[PDB]
Amino acid sequence: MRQLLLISDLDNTWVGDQQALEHLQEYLGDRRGNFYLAYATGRSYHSARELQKQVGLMEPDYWLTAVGSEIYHPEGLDQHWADYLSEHWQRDILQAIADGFEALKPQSPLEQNPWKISYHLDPQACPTVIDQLTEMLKETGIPVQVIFSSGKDVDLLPQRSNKGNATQYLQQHLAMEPSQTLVCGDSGNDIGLFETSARGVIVRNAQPELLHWYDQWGDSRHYRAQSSHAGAILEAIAHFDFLS
Ligand SMILES: OC[C@H]1O[C@@H](O)[C@H](O)[C@@H](O)[C@@H]1O
Numbered sequence: 433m434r435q436l437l438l439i440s441d442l443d444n445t446w447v448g449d450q451q452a453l454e455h456l457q458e459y460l461g462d463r464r465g466n467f468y469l470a471y472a473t474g475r476s477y478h479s480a481r482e483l484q485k486q487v488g489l490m491e492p493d494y495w496l497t498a499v500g501s502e503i504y505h506p507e508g509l510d511q512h513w514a515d516y517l518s519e520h521w522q523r524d525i526l527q528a529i530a531d532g533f534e535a536l537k538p539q540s541p542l543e544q545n546p547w548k549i550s551y552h553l554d555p556q557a558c559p560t561v562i563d564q565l566t567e568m569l570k571e572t573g574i575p576v577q578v579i580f581s582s583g584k585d586v587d588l589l590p591q592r593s594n595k596g597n598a599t600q601y602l603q604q605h606l607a608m609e610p611s612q613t614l615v616c617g618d619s620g621n622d623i624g625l626f627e628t629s630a631r632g633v634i635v636r637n638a639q640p641e642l643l644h645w646y647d648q649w650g651d652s653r654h655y656r657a658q659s660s661h662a663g664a665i666l667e668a669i670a671h672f673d674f675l676s
């Protein structure tokens with residue numbers, strides 16, 4: 433029903449360069465009816481909302497928050513997505529395992545939710561510890577996923593979650609094709625978006641994990657932008673000739 437499904441992360445992607453953000457929102461504001469907009473952020477809904485007030489984020493159609501662990505529709509939280517993410521999820525067990533790693537420190541309570549267990553990796557600790565955590569957690573047989581971004585943030589989510597799986601769920605809900613979709617990201621918590629078959633753009637200021645990911649899995653649907661922050665989205669839109 434629209435020609436584009438724009439999905440983007442906020443911090444360091446849409447947000448970061450105020451001028452680029454404003455001229456991106458200026459362009460989009462002249463063709464608002466031609467696209468669905470969804471923010472796929474690692475922030476909680478309340479936190480994303482607070483960011484909107486600070487930088488003046490244009491009202492999106494959907495909010496895919498906490499790395500896609502929660503989906504907000506114009507009319508409210510998606511309870512189907514929640515129940516779907518709840519099947520076979522054993523938060524307490526996974527948390528007990530992760531809490532036992534000396535190199536991991538729990539992130540603040542407000543960063544946690546029923547489908548998201550987050551920690552910070554010690555800056556002095558060896559990153560291979562994430563690999564050990566991942567192997568240990570998966571051997572529990574509990575459908576879990578490990579997200580590592582900015583060499584510091586660790587997120588434990590159900591396998592069914594991901595900014596990418598939430599995206600595919602949204603595409604199906606909106607009857608939008610991958611070819612009509614554009615995902616934008618900067619870090620390891622956006623890899624799930626690029627695993628999707630949608631067109632994607634990696635901001636110039638992308639984190640090391642994402643750049644390394646691109647080097648190995650990058651395909652022709654993946655565009656590595658020269659512009660950083662919001663500028664990369666305008667650039668990608670021109671590249672894939674979207675909003676023709
Ligand atoms: O997803 C990676 C990180 O993104 C941040 O935006 C969230 O506040 C944090 O909880 C998470 O660990």
Ligand SMILES: [Mg+2]
Nearest residue numbers: 441618619621
């Ligand atoms: Mg990100």
